[PDB]
């Protein structure tokens, strides 16, 4: 009956509009709309395949690195290049350290102020706030004195009358359920998170040459010159510098981020029972460790009917089962060709007609896997790893659940993971497991260089005539990414990116099935239709990236 | 005392220019927003959304009329009357012209805003342009790079705040402290260039000795910036050439996103 | 009369031997010996006056900067150069930031393990250690969880069986009086001190070009090119980076160092009643802020009879009363010429005769001021500032005394400052007042650049013929430093340094009067003459630097 | 888990070489002494003093015979039978020869220990020499500089610990990763040098534009080091030439402490 629009959705990457029909104060129907297009797929066409990665990296600066690595993986697949293992170690360290930064910033800078009321934090007792975390976390910056310094910075901000980024938030909104003490804790951790995410990006910068937008890749491996005895190249002093930053990440991730995930769950238990986006989930395996583009540290696969018994593992980026299921449809998007397209045959011809509830309403295409709507991202990667009986993922999830049980007396079953909070828990579990990936891959690099292997690059042989088709898969922070490259007569004849936020934010598909964002909103209670905080909470759980979704 | 107001509008942006702020150390993004400026509008960081964040912008445009710094990242798409970037049901170009009317100073951050950047490369599907082209009657301070070192932006804003005027600008309205010199005219591999000591393939003997990357397609010779001196992330020794990849000319209109990575600087 | 030797004295700069006669468990007589000589005053002779500062900076790497600034001030004195005020702001920021690092390292890394038992820290309860700083400090890193992380580092070092640096210290010695909790607090603060002193030295590095051993000076000003609009020079971005590190120092100095000084005093009250070195004190004024080498932020002067009403102010580095008084005697040092020598006529002709109780026993010369023995250093500079009625110094000392009073119920009179703990308190007060020097001089530099003044250097005119005499005074971390340059026919014909540790560590002088170290040890109780902790405590309070003392 | 032993002896040292460890970040001095090595003897940092600390030295020389890295800073004075540096009543030259006999590896840290440095300059009052001259027929690793970047030392020790051997050494036994190239053959001001753009006087127009310091007496053409690339203190952009002052040649025998600041270098 009542129709609302949230335009812009803030604390995401890029330009998103969400419309909702409300009946009986519950969302009955939703639309997700990507409102900005660049045509990155057309900009990259007719170039040398080697050039693509520097151009398509600029699809997104929040998930910097991801399109760069997927692009070189697509060119490598098209030319049958086996990537030197040292290049795999370096790509993997960059992706894991980038993803650490990404997840920390998502939980704190992008998501926390959905759950956390900064006006309530001013009313808190710093001593009581500190007392609450006794025996809960061993973090060294949870003192009453730390929380007092934080509370004073918020007091000074509010007193100035210039609240800036904090102006006109959902302060005093009925869906805000943290007590004053936990609000102050969350704000202290918000500011501490910014130090942790800076250390993560120092790892990326020392191998990438900067971030955002790394500049050390190549079709054929990496541009880092390994030489322990060389001045001005990647020597042992540079590697010790990288390791110094790797070593600074684990304490915050384990003693703050992991603990806050459980604390937020403890005060918002009904968010374990709403915000399901799909019954099908996809993830690609990630972090290859051999010289044949395989032996992934993290498994991938496909889950159906929200039932982990159906798990179909994917252990190769060359799996024809994964490659042949993927199509996209523009039936409800602003492009000319509406029938499902395999990406090697995809087109991206703009056809803006304006908004229509029943017609076209987004720049985001609608992907499908063998005709089905699928959620991608940390919940998908978590469910795949649990279905694979990965001990490390079970142990990490159980650590978060044990904190929740200690706070609530209650437990969390696999069924409750199909939820807004389950999606957030998946991301925290991912960030935690990535800290062992950084240690493992750093050590493997040190060991390999010690055996005399300094190989980082194989020159690609690009035939001047003939057609070659390649696909690069990558498990990005927001889920499975795929770059699809057709080379004809030495140049790119077609380039299609199917990006995780494309899967999740996609509009109604060729068989009029809603995408994950649109499904997740059905049944969302709305306390105030002019401030639909409950909608933004579920949407933020997917970590939307609309420059990624649309490109 | 009151903090100087900043209004930040993203057009066809990848959000890399905002993300640059999260790497900054002088100031850190938390000192920037709590101590040095009042960031009155920023869609990536704002607690408010939808109708409340549009209220924040119109309240800031009125309260701080004539006092705010207007920052734009991303290109502005002119094709088909602006429909390739729509915020709150209006073309972004309209948001930008409205905000630019009351601005004390206007900054295009990043190559996209400064000259159209990657979004305006190849066939330019959306007719993307730079901010100066949208605002032809205004002096736009350009801070190019994809993204620039965040301090190129922060020290520009600090100059305006501390000394009440913009820093010295070159002919393209770029601050001279960051863009006054070719990368190649202040590059520590110049001695290798001079001696003909060239890497010819990644992983080869010259490359593994830190020789000049001219023959891998370094654009340093035609790119203005401070990549070789200020470098990136304030850890010491981090820029693309130091880690062993040629400059792509991301700062420079007609070089980055136009020439091939391995296209040499003297080839058109 | 039992005879002990301590050789080497550790946790000082350079090579010190202390001998004590012990009668009835108390030291009755002492000898200080500097056991290493380089002849730095000879090495610099016959050079261009512009070259001296780079050579004589290597007198010491702990008090790096000090000899460099004193050398250029001496050449500038000889040549009647007025230093550009921007060159003064830069020299002052470097000296103040360096002195911050120096004092923090002295209290923690060099001194604390005289007063702190690390094996006793192992027995502490972290929660009780944390609870006893409630209302005493607002420091944000005094949590039970911080103290537990530190306790576990100590536990793991002991368990390895490799104590290295910490092996066979005075653990369990009866003069160790802190309870386990206050030992553990001190060790936690020791480790935190290392981060603070690193930030102090990042200030020094950004203006000096590196540290140790800055490289930004010149006879005539500094080598920093000021240009807000210049690429690769001292621009606004570089000045903002300097300010970011200045801003990080104050909280640790005010909330940890200042508080730990009062805490150590509280458990060691008789150390306010012994270790008097002298009844006469000298300090130079420091931190000139005009274009004429004057208008110092810190006053200096001369106090006699341990009676602050005798205070004679010194407000100029050209004060003939200060210049004419200073002499050195080698009557009891290993040099040829024994009568007191004014430094402009000074000689340094080595005459090693080995150890004699009644003859020559040291490479340190014995300085006098109008024939009197004088103590220099932060006690001296604190007494002069108190006597000059400097409200800042009174306020800062009173803040330390208030913490002491809260902890013990007793107070500290000025008479009790003439002591081992009074000397430590004077250094702490110095470190605290320097944080305002750093803020003041940074702001003065920004303001002056804004008025259009970018001048950093005046070119010296060095006449090819004629004789020119110059003296450079500097208030160094350890006290008044003076470099004395004679120029003849455009080259250095004589160079003499009179260094603060020369005053304090000097042997018996021409009239056989003991130096400050030697006097301060009279009356020291010795519980165990095989483990003379009490001697080492008194000597460390002077912050000995024997490369400085001897050069 | 046992940490590799290190014995550090100071001869005619200013303590700048020890102080350099307090600026290090990878590792920090606290991570060095608690996690990376066991520092079995160091006069500046040792809890123990006098007889007890000389006990620790003797205990360690015996227990770790054939296993410890011996580090020496400062020059060794041979004039008048060693009496210009006496520790515990003996010439330091004797302490050093004793410790050298059981050493797995021997490092001269700093120009004083490497070649005599400032202590052996001019008339050389004490007959100061470098470590290799007091230990003929022992392999000394030289890490020169006054003081060196502490990572030139730390990454040398790390190579020994991680790969079980020293890093690759040049003809003067300096690690090639730190000393393999002239500062002038990897200096970012080389383009200014090539074009004839020179600072003539501190504060002049060329100086304030960051031009080449050759004509102020820069020793970069005659000095092997990594000052232009690794630089100092890991904040980025900090070495003497970046700050505005010529290289003095402190790393290089016959340059530092022998040539005048403003005396011109020979260029190859
Ligand atoms: N993570 C991530 Fe991106 Ni801005 C999305 N969605 C891309 O792969
Ligand atoms: N402070 C100090 Fe030095 Ni190593 C002494 N004594 C110098 O002047
Ligand atoms: S300039 Fe580069 S980083 Fe900035 S918006 Fe454009 S593509 Fe993104
Ligand atoms: S690497 Fe690039 S900028 Fe540097 S000297 Fe070579 S061509 Fe020039
Ligand atoms: S090399 Fe330099 S810093 Fe090291 S001891 Fe010698 S003079 Fe001091
Ligand atoms: S002379 Fe010095 S400043 Fe000039 S290019 Fe050579 S090393 Fe660099
Ligand atoms: S590609 Fe861009 S970041 Fe600098 S090194 Fe070249 S202008
Ligand atoms: S003086 Fe020394 S520190 Fe490097 S810049 Fe020259 S070799
Ligand atoms: Mg696509
Ligand atoms: Mg002297």
CATH domain fold name of chain A? Cytochrome-c3 Hydrogenase, chain B
- Helix coverage percent of chain B: 25-40%
Largest sheet of chain B: 5 strands, parallel
Number of strands of chain B: 9
Structural class of chain B: alpha/beta
CATH class of chain A: Mainly Alpha
| Biggest sheet features of chain A | 3 strands, antiparallel
Count of helical regions of chain A: 18
Terminal residue distance of chain A = 34 Å
Shape of chain A: globular
Q: What's the total number of strands of chain A?
A: 15
Oligomer: heterotetramer
CATH architecture of chain A: Orthogonal Bundle
Q: Give every kind of bound small molecule, once each.
A: formyl[bis(hydrocyanato-1kappaC)]ironnickel(Fe-Ni), iron/sulfur cluster, FE3-S4 cluster, magnesium ion
CATH topology of the domain at 5-163 in chain B: Rossmann fold
Strand content of chain B: 5-15%
Question: How many independent structural domains of chain A?
Answer: 1
Question: Ends of chain B: how far apart?
Answer: 54 Å
GO molecular function (chains B, D): 3 iron, 4 sulfur cluster binding; 4 iron, 4 sulfur cluster binding; electron transfer activity; ferredoxin hydrogenase activity; hydrogenase (acceptor) activity; metal ion binding
Protein name (chains B, D): Hydrogenase-2 small chain
Membrane topology (chains B, D): Peripheral membrane protein
Enzyme class (chains B, D): oxidoreductase
Account of the protein in words:
The complex is a heterotetramer, with 2 copies of chain A (551 residues) and 2 copies of chain B (268 residues). Chain A is built from 18 helices and 15 strands. Chain A has 551 residues and is an alpha+beta fold. In chain A, helix 6 packs across helix 7, helix 10 packs antiparallel against helix 14 and helix 12 crosses helix 14. Chain A is globular. Chain B is of the alpha/beta class. Chain B has a domain of 159 residues: Rossmann fold (3-Layer(aba) Sandwich). Chain B has a 5-stranded parallel β-sheet, sandwiched between helices. In chain B, strands 4-8 form a two-stranded antiparallel ribbon. A two-stranded antiparallel sheet of chain B has the order 5-6. In chain B, a hairpin with a 2-residue loop joins strand 5 and strand 6. The termini of chain B are far apart. Chains in contact: A-B, A-C, A-D, B-C, B-D, C-D. Chains C and D meet through helix 1, helix 4, helix 7, helix 8 and strand 5 of C and helix 1, helix 2, strand 2, helix 3 and strand 5 of D. One FE3-S4 cluster binds next to loops of chain B.
